[model samples]
Target chain A: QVKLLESGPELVKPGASVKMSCKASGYTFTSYVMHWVKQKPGQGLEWIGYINPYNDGTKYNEKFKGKATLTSDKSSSTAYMELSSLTSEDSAVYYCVRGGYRPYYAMDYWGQGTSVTVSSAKTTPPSVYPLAPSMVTLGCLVKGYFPEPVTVTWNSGSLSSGVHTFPAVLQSDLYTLSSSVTVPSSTWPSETVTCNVAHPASSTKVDKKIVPR
Target chain B: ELQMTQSPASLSASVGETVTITCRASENIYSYLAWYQQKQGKSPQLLVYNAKTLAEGVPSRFSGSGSGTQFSLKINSLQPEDFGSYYCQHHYGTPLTFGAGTKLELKRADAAPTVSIFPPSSEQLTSGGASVVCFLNNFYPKDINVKWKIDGSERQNGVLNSWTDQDSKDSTYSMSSTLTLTKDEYERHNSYTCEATHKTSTSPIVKSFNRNE
Candidate 1:
């Protein structure tokens, strides 16, 4: 199984540059090229560029030219991308993808995504909003927070699976995120389905009940 | 010698709800049965062995009771992680036997699946025939019935259905069905409809593709 492990989340100031690495394993890393893709906050994807570890050759999308540099270390089977002069627009998730055999660059396999936050910076408490009242699906939108890293849980149990928490999206110098979970519809408004959010930035724990009308 | 039979091939309940699953041996096994819980993709975990003893590290909420031909595994306050397939095995004789598995799921009150019918794509269309795909997303309990039709008549030929797939991000289930039609039939048929029957809805949810549109 091909695997790509990207670096952890990053919080950086505007105009600062950030370099992230994607470690490749489980296959011959040099036999294929490594490509990167960028996804802005609630936005479409933008192909950044690709680097061939076999020869150190590179290619870039015109839009990312000069702004993004791609490199690779054949010795460690690691691919690297550095964003120069980062701005709020650069605050997004960057994914490393594997490009397959010669002439046919079938890009398969993707990293779990590395979140980069270009902060303009604060400790604003997130305003949690109920995004869904769908019978089996409940969603919590955590908006306007700072300094990255927040925890969300179902009741007292920390459930990572069966729950989706999107990467923190930067807007107006604050970070916003959304999480959703599926539960038994029978246990609706009567069951006290609480979405618990812990924001270390503001040292606050918010428990919002999803009461559907 | 003993033969085991499990009750309620499947059971559904919400989090925090008390649940009891039972196993009956054809002959008295003298509390020699063991209970195991298997998550969707993981190996079975021994929850109770020798009838009433909890395995090491098991939470206090889980307990086993009863003896002779009848025994049970009781979950006092079911957590989200408690939902899985449960089985009972007896060590009463050589060539031990196991009871048929019991699937425990969250009891869904109501949630109609979201359906999408994608017309044959340009690449999917061929000179001889084309395949139309239909998707049903975000339904619970995993039981669903999907049918394809032309002009309101159920047609089974050239129809293919996929096994139910659970979304790790939300735990809800999804399925896809495809229908193949020859070039001649594609031009003559004005409407193709996909009807999905789910427990959440009283009537079948129908989605159709119109060639004229």
Candidate 2:
């Protein structure tokens, strides 16, 4: 068994830089390669690059060549990803993952993410986008907000309340969330996809809506 | 990066039906392939890999089979949880590459349609992106709005592909919207929102992305 954990700055100046650490244990350090990945709130996973522990060889996604740097310390079996030229766009969760060795058979064993928010010069209330409706669903991207974390729930006014909502995904900022909801047709009844936001900061609460055409 | 292509772009099915999505690689990919399921604002979950080996914890209903440049992900007895975008990744290569994606959805006899927009399916040879689809389905009585664009220019020709379930207890249907574009439109590097038209809304609800930044 092997373990990989991460440590990173919670917030940094937009123009600054941050280096996060991934400490590994419970296994031989030089056996497997370590890979670094990025997640921007609720979007898809972006593969950054991989670090070869045995020979210190490195390969990166063309997308991250200059934006991210990966290094590993065999002495500690720990890997590091140094991100420079920080911008709000660089704000995301970074994780350390283990790749296979020798014959390179498999890949898995993910590390907990380190949330690195590239802070702007200021903060403000959450701005909700207009209700963009599909035939039977509704969605929105609420950008710019605050607090340790937040809760998202589903509700309805004129329909059955058994609505399903996608988990809120933070934007690069980590606080701004983008999400959507829909009603099942078999169970849907002139439905409603009313969303609720409860932030540690009280001013961010609002009932966002989802609808059917 | 190796070019990957997936078809149907999106589909709708239920627990009793089988959903099979196909993927093809640019060159001889041998048997190296991985299929993943991704939800909105969530990380991709590894499902099937190496053409057919089931990932740990993934239900047997899901499977991968085929080799060389051809591959497919077959879901037997589809469950509600299997409804989402399914992505394919190839292993026998340098920088890891993935299929643009195939969205999987489930709907009853006359449910309202659920919509999903896809970024253009890309290929290295096609430096500019190729046309992709903006998928919609999962409703008994389908209604969708798709207003697509390229570099802010209104682009048209969205096809409606729909079908009815004969094996189910009732008459249920799933439909889709597909759009293809010019190579000139593909490499524009301009921002786009593949809008669909449904309801009283001007657009089906576009997913705004530019370099996914």
Candidate 3:
């Protein structure tokens, strides 16, 4: 039942510092030490360091001596690591490993890795695609946005109960999203439905309309 | 970095006797040593950490002593199951290192393994092929030999034997073998058998995957 929940994925700019967390449960937090490991995408693992929660003692790998800092909160059974002066080479998955029991070499439990992507800041607007694909079903497809955080509303500004919005899907460095709404069959042929797409990263919004054909 | 040297490549003992394993570090490890027990076919289990702290669930009979560069793991009143390997590690600095293991064995041994064969799951019963798994558990002396038979002939291809594993709870060993068959081959075969031989048994243990059962 041992479990570790790490923080969510992160997007950071170069020269910035990112702090990630790993919450441990199902075992006494202070009894064993926790280690932090880094795995660059497509690269082998690099040991960072370990923090002893019972005594707050820590040991760091020489390579990570200045790049990583490890700490823990006994009250919350959570471990934290802060990486400083990030670069493209630092873009990789960070895992909080529970160095179990005695020898502590066997990493028994691990948090689902937290991904940290370091990239130069860029903003891209979403391109909207609106159509009446299923007769009574009106849909909008928003494609290509950077840094996520996009909102799609039905009927311009008013919220409709018949709407369904899918989560943003990431591909390469851009994200694509979709929203659909069901309209009454009686008014489907004559009414015009609008899809409002909002892109916060680019600070822009576009209204896509599906007109009667 | 501290180098750890563990002595006594192998030892033989009785059920009620006490034995000790020693580890010496090239430099002062400052009570940063840890001890591990790896029973036959099992991954290493932490016994003592931070030099002398017995890990949780480790019996009081298992003790660790010494400090600085010299450390030892002592098991008083050894049990029949305490037959495997012991390791020592030091985490005083970067490049944590482990000592060469000491293999512990029982002067005498006995125990028969339990066997079970799991039919191919529904998901694996596809158009392409299927993999049927055979499991053997709770055996002594670690080493095991396994073979697969299709119908009445021994099958050499599409057979895989996993490394024997030990159960830390009982100090017994377990292992598994898998057989893969194409759709046509599966439908044509009437019987598939998995045979396992261990030190405790004069004859091999047999389990079968029948077409109709």
Candidate 4:
């Protein structure tokens, strides 16, 4: 029953202001930070930033520094992402995801998502999606999804020359979790090593098929 | 704000050409260095961070690794869609600083960027709701461009493209775009196209995709 709900508007005007809300109800909001993601119409996920529920301390992706303002309210276990100077480009959907656990690295739980469409300088268009993509020492790091504890596994090419898994720390509640599989020393990058993650909770899963040299 | 000293004022490469970009932090960032990718007209993409880690969906070819005050973004095999311009930011403390961005570009290695239709994740592959990713790889000259179409109708809502990354070993750079569709849109026309253009190509490298794909 752990959940995060993001609510805002269906549309807005260019250069107008948009304030959204992400409400955490299933768990103690103070125990985790809230992460905001931007999905413009149809696109990959962008990590705007995260709010430390307990302190309202914020960290943002440099690109979103001024465009996004993050704040949190302990009284309600809710975090907010305020966007200023909305452009046609800002017309998109967004979500509040749980960067579960402290020192988090991945998102285990996510809200349904709030879409804000951008219209011709007069109306707003909404659309968005899940997860933050990243990487590490020849391995893979996938964070910022929802519904705690996604599945991670490795695919062997008719063999198990070698494979290893490491932890992934991220931002937000039930998020900030990352466990990675390393390439076996004996294998070549061209051999096609695949890391598969299935988030049944949010219908979000990814497989990184990597062939290293 | 921590001061960052980034090496290689400007970088040049082509399809298949790969290399690494480095940044020196003013002090110990404790592996908190993050590398972001930015193109002239798009938002910056978070390529690597947590010292040497990849974000979710990041191809394994791109790597981030470093220690203490130094860090690196290594591109194993480069793609072409987007030129690689990088910046490293160290957070984990105040001085809240970042380094001068490195401009990674294409110096001519490949031809037209190879455009492929991809998906957000396996889980997003449903009949009613699904997302497809547009990946531009192989071909060159950077400045890659692409547009989306549903049932032959050109559209722009819910389309996301990423900053380009490089495969240092080859000198190629890669970039991606995405499109999300609901069950209604999926069933309506069932035709999706990824039409792309780069500095090298005259006509668009147009390709078609559908839900089954």
The top-ranked prediction according to TM-score is 2
- To one decimal, what is the Cα RMSD in angstroms of model 3 from the true structure? 17.6
Q: How well is each residue in B52-84 modelled by candidate 1, as lDDT tens digits? A: 888767798999998999999999999888888
Judged by DockQ cut-offs, the docking class of candidate 2 is: incorrect
> Candidate 3 at residue B192, lDDT?
82
Model 2 stretches with alpha carbons more than 4 Å out: A1-3, A7-14, A25-27, A39-45, A75-77, A88-93, A102-106, A112-121, A124-149, A152-213, B39-42, B111-213
Off by over 4 Å in 4: A1-10, A14-16, A23-28, A35-50, A55-78, A83-120, A123-213, B1-19, B24-30, B35-50, B53-63, B75-89, B94-213
DockQ of 2: 0.08
DockQ comparisons of all candidates to the true complex:
0.01, 0.08, 0.03, 0.03
Residue-level lDDT tens digits of model 2 in B81-182: 677788787777556667778877666544444455544433311544243443344444345445666668776653333232221333333333434445
How many Å off is the CA of B31 in candidate 2?
1.2
Native-contact fraction for each model?
Answer: 0.00, 0.06, 0.04, 0.00
**Better candidate number, 2 or 4, judged by TM-score:** 2
> Per-residue lDDT for B10 in model 3?
77
Q: After superposition, how far is residue B32 of candidate 1 from its true place, in Å?
A: 1.0
Give the per-residue Cα lDDT of candidate 3 at B105: 70
Predicted candidate 3 versus true structure: per-residue lDDT over B1-213, tens digit per residue: 556788887786777999998999999978888777755423356778777888778889989899988889899999866767888878665666678778787654567766656555443355355555665555676778888888989988766554333344455555556566776777788798889888777889898867765
Report the lDDT tens digits of candidate 2 across residue range A114-147.
8887766334456444233323444444445653
The candidate 2 chain A region of ten consecutive residues with least summed lDDT is: A160-169
Between candidates 2 and 4, the one scoring higher on lDDT is 2
The regions of model 3 sitting more than 4 angstroms off are A1-20, A23-47, A50-59, A63-79, A82-213, B7-15, B28-70, B78-87, B91-108, B117-128, B151-157, B160-171, B188-191, B201-203, B208-213
